[PDB]
Amino acid sequence: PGIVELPSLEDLKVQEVKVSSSVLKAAAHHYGAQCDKPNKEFMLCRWEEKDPRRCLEEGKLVNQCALEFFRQIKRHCAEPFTEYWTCIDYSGLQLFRRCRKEQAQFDKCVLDKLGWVRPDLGELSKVTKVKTDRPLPENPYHSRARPEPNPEVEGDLKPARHGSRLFFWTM
Amino acid sequence: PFFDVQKKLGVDLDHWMTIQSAEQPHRIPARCHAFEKEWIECAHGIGSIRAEKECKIEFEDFRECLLRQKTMKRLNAIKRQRDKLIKEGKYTPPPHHSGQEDLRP
Amino acid sequence: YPTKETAHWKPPPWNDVDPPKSNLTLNFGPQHPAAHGVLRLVMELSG
Amino acid sequence: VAAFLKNVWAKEPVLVASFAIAGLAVILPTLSPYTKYSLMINRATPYNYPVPLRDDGNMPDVPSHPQDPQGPSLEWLKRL
Amino acid sequence: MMTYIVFILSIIFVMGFVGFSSKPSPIYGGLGLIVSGGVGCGIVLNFGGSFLGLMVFLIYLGGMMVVFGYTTAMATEQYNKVVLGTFITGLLMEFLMVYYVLKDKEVEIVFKFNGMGDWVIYDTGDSGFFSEEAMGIAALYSYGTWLVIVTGWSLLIGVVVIMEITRGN
Amino acid sequence: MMTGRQARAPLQFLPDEARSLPPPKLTDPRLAYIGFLGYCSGLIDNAIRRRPVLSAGLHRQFLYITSFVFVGYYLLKRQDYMYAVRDHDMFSYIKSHPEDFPEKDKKTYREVFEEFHPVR
Amino acid sequence: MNPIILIIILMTVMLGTIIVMISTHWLLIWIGFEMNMLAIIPIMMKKHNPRATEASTKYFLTQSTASMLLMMAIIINLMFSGQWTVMKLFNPMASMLMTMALAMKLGMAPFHFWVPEVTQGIPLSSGLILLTWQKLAPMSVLYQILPSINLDLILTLSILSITIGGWGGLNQTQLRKIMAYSSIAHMGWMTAVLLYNPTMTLLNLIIYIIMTSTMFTLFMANSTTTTLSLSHTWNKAPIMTILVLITLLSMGGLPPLSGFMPKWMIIQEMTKNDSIILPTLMAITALLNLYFYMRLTYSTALTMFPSTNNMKMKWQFPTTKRMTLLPTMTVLSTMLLPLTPILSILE
Amino acid sequence: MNLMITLLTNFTLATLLVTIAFWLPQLNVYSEKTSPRLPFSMKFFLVAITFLLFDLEIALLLPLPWASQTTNLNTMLTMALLLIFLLAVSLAYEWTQKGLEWTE
Amino acid sequence: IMKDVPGWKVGESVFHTTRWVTPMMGELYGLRTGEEILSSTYGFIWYT
Amino acid sequence: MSLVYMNIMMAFTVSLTGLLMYRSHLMSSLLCLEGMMLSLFILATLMILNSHFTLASMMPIILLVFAACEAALGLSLLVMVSNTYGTDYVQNLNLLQC
Numbered sequence A: 001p002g003i004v005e006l007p008s009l010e011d012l013k014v015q016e017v018k019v020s021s022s023v024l025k026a027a028a029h030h031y032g033a034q035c036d037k038p039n040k041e042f043m044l045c046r047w048e049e050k051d052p053r054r055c056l057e058e059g060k061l062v063n064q065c066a067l068e069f070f071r072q073i074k075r076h077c078a079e080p081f082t083e084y085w086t087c088i089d090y091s092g093l094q095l096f097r098r099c100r101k102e103q104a105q106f107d108k109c110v111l112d113k114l115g116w117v118r119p120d121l122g123e124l125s126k127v128t129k130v131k132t133d134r135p136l137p138e139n140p141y142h143s144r145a146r147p148e149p150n151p152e153v154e155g156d157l158k159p160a161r162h163g164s165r166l167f168f169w170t171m
Numbered sequence B: 001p002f003f004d005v006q007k008k009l010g011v012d013l014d015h016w017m018t019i020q021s022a023e024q025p026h027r028i029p030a031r032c033h034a035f036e037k038e039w040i041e042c043a044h045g046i047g048s049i050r051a052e053k054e055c056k057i058e059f060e061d062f063r064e065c066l067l068r069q070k071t072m073k074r075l076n077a078i079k080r081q082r083d084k085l086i087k088e089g090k091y092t093p094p095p096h097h098s099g100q101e102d103l104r105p
Numbered sequence C: 001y002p003t004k005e006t007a008h009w010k011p012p013p014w015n016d017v018d019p020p021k022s023n024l025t026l027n028f029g030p031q032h033p034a035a036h037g038v039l040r041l042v043m044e045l046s047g
Numbered sequence D: 001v002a003a004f005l006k007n008v009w010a011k012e013p014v015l016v017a018s019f020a021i022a023g024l025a026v027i028l029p030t031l032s033p034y035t036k037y038s039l040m041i042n043r044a045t046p047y048n049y050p051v052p053l054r055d056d057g058n059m060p061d062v063p064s065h066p067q068d069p070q071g072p073s074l075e076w077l078k079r080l
Numbered sequence E: 001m002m003t004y005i006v007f008i009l010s011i012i013f014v015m016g017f018v019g020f021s022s023k024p025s026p027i028y029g030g031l032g033l034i035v036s037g038g039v040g041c042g043i044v045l046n047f048g049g050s051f052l053g054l055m056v057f058l059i060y061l062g063g064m065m066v067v068f069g070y071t072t073a074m075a076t077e078q079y080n081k082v083v084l085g086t087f088i089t090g091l092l093m094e095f096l097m098v099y100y101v102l103k104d105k106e107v108e109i110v111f112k113f114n115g116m117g118d119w120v121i122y123d124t125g126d127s128g129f130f131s132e133e134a135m136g137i138a139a140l141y142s143y144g145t146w147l148v149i150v151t152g153w154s155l156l157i158g159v160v161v162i163m164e165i166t167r168g169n
Numbered sequence F: 001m002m003t004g005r006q007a008r009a010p011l012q013f014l015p016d017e018a019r020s021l022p023p024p025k026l027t028d029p030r031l032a033y034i035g036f037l038g039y040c041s042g043l044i045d046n047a048i049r050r051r052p053v054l055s056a057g058l059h060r061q062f063l064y065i066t067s068f069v070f071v072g073y074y075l076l077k078r079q080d081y082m083y084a085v086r087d088h089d090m091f092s093y094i095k096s097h098p099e100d101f102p103e104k105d106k107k108t109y110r111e112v113f114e115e116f117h118p119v120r
Numbered sequence G: 001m002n003p004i005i006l007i008i009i010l011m012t013v014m015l016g017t018i019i020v021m022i023s024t025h026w027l028l029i030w031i032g033f034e035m036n037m038l039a040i041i042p043i044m045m046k047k048h049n050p051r052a053t054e055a056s057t058k059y060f061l062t063q064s065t066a067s068m069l070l071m072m073a074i075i076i077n078l079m080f081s082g083q084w085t086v087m088k089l090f091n092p093m094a095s096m097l098m099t100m101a102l103a104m105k106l107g108m109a110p111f112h113f114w115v116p117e118v119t120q121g122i123p124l125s126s127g128l129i130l131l132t133w134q135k136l137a138p139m140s141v142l143y144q145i146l147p148s149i150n151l152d153l154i155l156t157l158s159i160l161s162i163t164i165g166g167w168g169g170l171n172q173t174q175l176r177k178i179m180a181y182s183s184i185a186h187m188g189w190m191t192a193v194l195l196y197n198p199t200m201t202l203l204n205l206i207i208y209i210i211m212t213s214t215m216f217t218l219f220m221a222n223s224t225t226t227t228l229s230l231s232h233t234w235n236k237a238p239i240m241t242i243l244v245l246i247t248l249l250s251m252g253g254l255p256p257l258s259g260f261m262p263k264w265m266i267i268q269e270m271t272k273n274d275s276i277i278l279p280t281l282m283a284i285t286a287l288l289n290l291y292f293y294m295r296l297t298y299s300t301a302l303t304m305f306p307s308t309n310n311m312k313m314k315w316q317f318p319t320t321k322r323m324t325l326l327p328t329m330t331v332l333s334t335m336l337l338p339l340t341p342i343l344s345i346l347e
Numbered sequence H: 001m002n003l004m005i006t007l008l009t010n011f012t013l014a015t016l017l018v019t020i021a022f023w024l025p026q027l028n029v030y031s032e033k034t035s036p037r038l039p040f041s042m043k044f045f046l047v048a049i050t051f052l053l054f055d056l057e058i059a060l061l062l063p064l065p066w067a068s069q070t071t072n073l074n075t076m077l078t079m080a081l082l083l084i085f086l087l088a089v090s091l092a093y094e095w096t097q098k099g100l101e102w103t104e
Numbered sequence I: 001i002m003k004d005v006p007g008w009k010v011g012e013s014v015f016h017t018t019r020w021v022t023p024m025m026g027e028l029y030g031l032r033t034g035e036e037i038l039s040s041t042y043g044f045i046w047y048t
Numbered sequence J: 001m002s003l004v005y006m007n008i009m010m011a012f013t014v015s016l017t018g019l020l021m022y023r024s025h026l027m028s029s030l031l032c033l034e035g036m037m038l039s040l041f042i043l044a045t046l047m048i049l050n051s052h053f054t055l056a057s058m059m060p061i062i063l064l065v066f067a068a069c070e071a072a073l074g075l076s077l078l079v080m081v082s083n084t085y086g087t088d089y090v091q092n093l094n095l096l097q098c
């Protein structure tokens, strides 16, 4: 069959978010509050194209808006955030419930110096609508033409011509 | 004597476990969901006789998704040629195929 | 049709019932011989 | 029925406690006002990803941001 | 070697089946089926069937083979050529199959078989905050309603049937 | 053979298009033969229990006759329905495929040469 | 047995058969066969003698082996198709194993070696259930998997079943073994026409169940398990000799009887597909079935064997048995050939 | 992996204890000592089969703590109470037909 | 690697479709070392 | 196909040919039957976990439950045979030759 088409290694170069999972999980609610639009453009493009090769520019926009988010944390509230993700980072399950005072300090400093509001319980699982400029994928499964169906039955049902026609049975 | 009582009464006794492309708990996709969906939506309504000779490509893609025989045969060819070139000394493995390049994310 | 192989075959019983074709005996003693220790019991147990 | 109940509670109280606990387990969730909230909490637990919708132009109930007013809410769960 | 762990456990599995299926005695046959059930459980566990492997240990080895050894103890007496000969026959057939599918990375007895480690065929993604195997088993109560009805009816009928045929009257 | 026809609508003994067909008359010789089978079942039922064969249980003989006629009427309706379905599918398949059913150029016996084999 | 428990266990037998007949999933097919065997085991052990325990053990071993081969065929189908719909099988190995498993469940030759032993070991009512109702579910699965059934396999099983069920009944004097070898020959007749027209398969199965139900009901009503005990029936109830005469003449395939209907329709649908040698050899082989049927008619109805003195006491008592549907089944097994185009209701 | 290491270590310590307990009392040479079917019960087999069938019913009951998380709770609760009820009905039929007798 | 091999299409799909197929474990970690293979393919199962 | 499927199917056939060739004991026959079930369990489980076919995760449990109830039925048959003949030998089950 055909040759698979892959992007070059230059097209896969982006400035990664080289932080740990507790750094992300500590920042995850404000990240979902603030980096909404490129993330949902990317996930809409990702569930519609069904191909990670058509989604690389939205992936780079996600990977860029996340860096802008952490730079904007780093300019104002580096120390409460650092204490908070260290407390998140101690726990083996990384519990939010063990870390409520450091979360309170980080949310206080984030609401004061950046105006960011933490999402309530129920908001980051809402289904949101995304305004895109890319076209809707018209055949994302790359399905070929379906076979034409068998003909339907039509007409009125007449009696059997001379009955059963089983050897001599005249009905 | 397939007495299709389920389609007669409208009950769903076992149509849910019948295929991989059905409704799954927590919307978990099967690893060959698209291939099975393509083969079923091809072969739907045209019968077995037309489905074996008109939907052959979709069923071959789906069987090769399931069993991965051509994929494993292709990897066997590449790996055997690689090991022959390593034994002959005419090929070197790159550092990113030896654990020396500080992986992506 | 009688043969040499099917020669010893008799017909089955008329009610299709065949003949059936015991109980345990225990030589018993007290577990720790502190109290009694000098008892012998020949049981006939039925399970 | 009061003589039989006291008699079976005198003779076989383990079976009376068995049938009483089993009968409460059967008829009690249809009488409880919190059986609704079990369904409400299980359908509100977000296992999958909330795959967003293409904004065609007419979806007034769907929010554009998670912190928008419209959309499904869990204030009943915070409060109870 | 360590990438072939499921394969090596499957070789131990076939060796255990050649062990008990050559039938030395129902006691040692039970022992061979116990060791075989344990290593086949390990085969299932190394794909991510942790609940299904614990179902092997808890149900298969835990109840059923215990009842087999129990009933054997009531029907055999406590105190050959054909068993050991059939044992080494099955062992040589299995090792010749191993040798072919290892030196060739390919064999065909009834179907074509790969010779690489079966690590190759796995998925490269996650399941999130659940096990897919656990959620599919949990759906026996919400999706498998008819399946639960016929399974419970067969088990109740099975209790009735065992009390009928062991009654003797 | 016709199992894909009655698979869109399963377990219908008489479909709605069976009503376009004329029902069997109640003086159908097939249905009268089934009534004769009911009378014979009544006679065998009086004979195996050593009742008088023609006299005993006239209510029972009449219920035998009635029950066989009642079942056989719907059996004849389904029989005529399935043969009508068979002819309907035959004619629609011939109509949809004219290349597989060419209208045969019929020659008369003045052009047809048949080899004569004498009996002598 | 408790009559409540008897009714529940027979409903569970029927339930397993219905679950095989209605379900669209292979696991539920296997579940139906498991439930069917699990429920029919007490019916075979109804009288609790060592022949019934031996018969139930042999039946258990054969049906268990067939159920495990059925599940292996289902598992190879799940490999090579990724799904579970009860339809054609997507691998010839799964098709071979499932055809073997259903051949073991039907007791077709060369997997026939349990049917006369198990039928002899059990009573006449349980033998009736085994030889009529237990044929329904595997023929339904064969009816559904026929786009994948290998032709040479099913016709080998068919002609081997017809030949071995012909030669097996010629040596028999026990009635249950005669009915079992009759079963093997008629299952060969059913599966021979399966890939050609399965409506005629269902016609053969229905006429066979009617005639076998008639013969087992006559054998129950006369309480005769051997040829020579059936020979005393003329001095006890002479109408029963007439009924077993016409039913044995029907099962031999003689016109104008309705046992000629299935084999005539099978020959009729096998000559359409340009097979001439095979229905001719099948028809000539069925003359052996007719031979031991005529042996039984000679011993029962056409001659008068010697009776004993104690039959005079049994003259003074009527049959108080529920001869359920015996006149209906006797009429349907003999006088149905004028209604031969009724077979279209099974289309 | 760590599980396999732990199983091998427990098996090794157990085999070492068994090998010591068989070979360490063979050090002291002792005076070599020169002087000098079972009955079936139906109830013993029946309690084992009753165990096996109720254990299969338990095998059906084991996915319940995962099954409560479903969105089809009314069907789930119905089938859960139905499996426990069929286990209780198996126990009641085992009771009333003299099955739990002399090993009650 | 596959230069000396005659008739070899590099990057040839084993599927007739042009749809993106999710890669297999052997397609990604096929040419890499056995330690990375084990850590990617049995790591979560063997984790503690 | 995959390499482990060869060994699991060969395990099924080994327990098959064990079950199809009796030595003396009916218990060893039932052991071979449940070894067939064990190999079927493992093979179905490896397919269903490999495919990520979620709903068929309950299939091997239903297989295990039905076939262990079947095994209980077979053990009760063996127990009745052993109470008849004293042993569980398959050469004692030969009354139905005539």
Ligand SMILES: CCCCCCCCCCCCCCCCCC(=O)OC[C@H](COP(=O)([O-])OC[C@H](O)COP(=O)([O-])OC[C@H](COC(=O)CCCCCCCCCCCCCCCCC)OC(=O)CCCCCCCCCCCCCCCCC)OC(=O)CCCCCCCCCCCCCCCCC
Pocket (backbone or CB within 6 Å): A168, A169, A170, A171, F027, F028, F029, F030, F032, F033, F036, G256, G337, G338, G339
């Ligand atoms: C205003 C509203 C009301 C208006 C009312 C208008 C009518 C007024 C009269 C009402 C009564 C009508 C009765 C039925 C009409 C006549 C049917 C007829 O004769 O068909 C000729 C039919 C074909 O001849 P056709 O010259 O082409 O047609 C003349 C008509 O146009 C025939 O017309 P078709 O072309 O429409 O015929 C249709 C087709 C024409 O037939 C065919 O296409 C050929 C296939 C026929 C069956 C071949 C089966 C071969 C294997 C079985 C051999 C059986 C051997 C004989 C019996 C042995 C002992 C049981 O027949 C069938 O498919 C039915 C099957 C045969 C049953 C015939 C009716 C019997 C009713 C009474 C039964 C009593 C027992 C009789 C013996 C049982 C056996 C018949 O010939 C035969 O079937 C030969 C046998 C004779 C039939 C029975 C004669 C009826 C009267 C019997 C009274 C005497 C009973 C004696 C005591 C009991 C026996 C011991």
Ligand SMILES: CCCCCCCCCCCCCCCCCC(=O)OC[C@H](COP(=O)(O)OCCN)OC(=O)CCCCCCCCCCCCCCCCC
Pocket (backbone or CB within 6 Å): D008, D012, D015, D016, D017, D018, D019, D020, D022, D023, D026, H085, H088, H089, H091, H092, H095, H096
């Ligand atoms: C409706 C909800 C769901 C119900 C089903 C679920 C039940 C869960 C519990 C499982 C129980 C399993 C075993 C049941 C066996 C019942 C039969 C029984 O035990 O009968 C025998 C007993 C007498 O005991 P005996 O045989 O003598 O014991 C030897 C020592 N003497 O006989 C007796 O003691 C009499 C037993 C019958 C009467 C019991 C009445 C209890 C009433 C409690 C309050 C009402 C609860 C609602 C249920 C309706 C009860 C009528």
Ligand SMILES: CCCCCCCCCCCCCCCCCC(=O)OC[C@H](COP(=O)(O)OCCN)OC(=O)CCCCCCCCCCCCCCCCC
Pocket (backbone or CB within 6 Å): B001, G010, G125, G126, G128, G129, G132, G133, G136, G202, G206, G209, G210, G213, G217, G220, G322, G323, G324, G325, G329
């Ligand atoms: C595509 C097909 C779909 C399905 C179509 C329908 C298939 C029907 C298959 C019928 C199979 C019948 C098997 C036998 C009945 C089962 C229950 C039973 O065993 O009843 C007999 C009963 C038991 O009583 P018991 O006391 O235990 O017996 C010892 C004698 N004292 O009582 C006795 O022993 C008394 C003696 C008389 C028993 C006569 C029973 C006749 C039942 C069958 C009637 C004919 C079948 C229906 C018509 C044809 C349908 C195709």
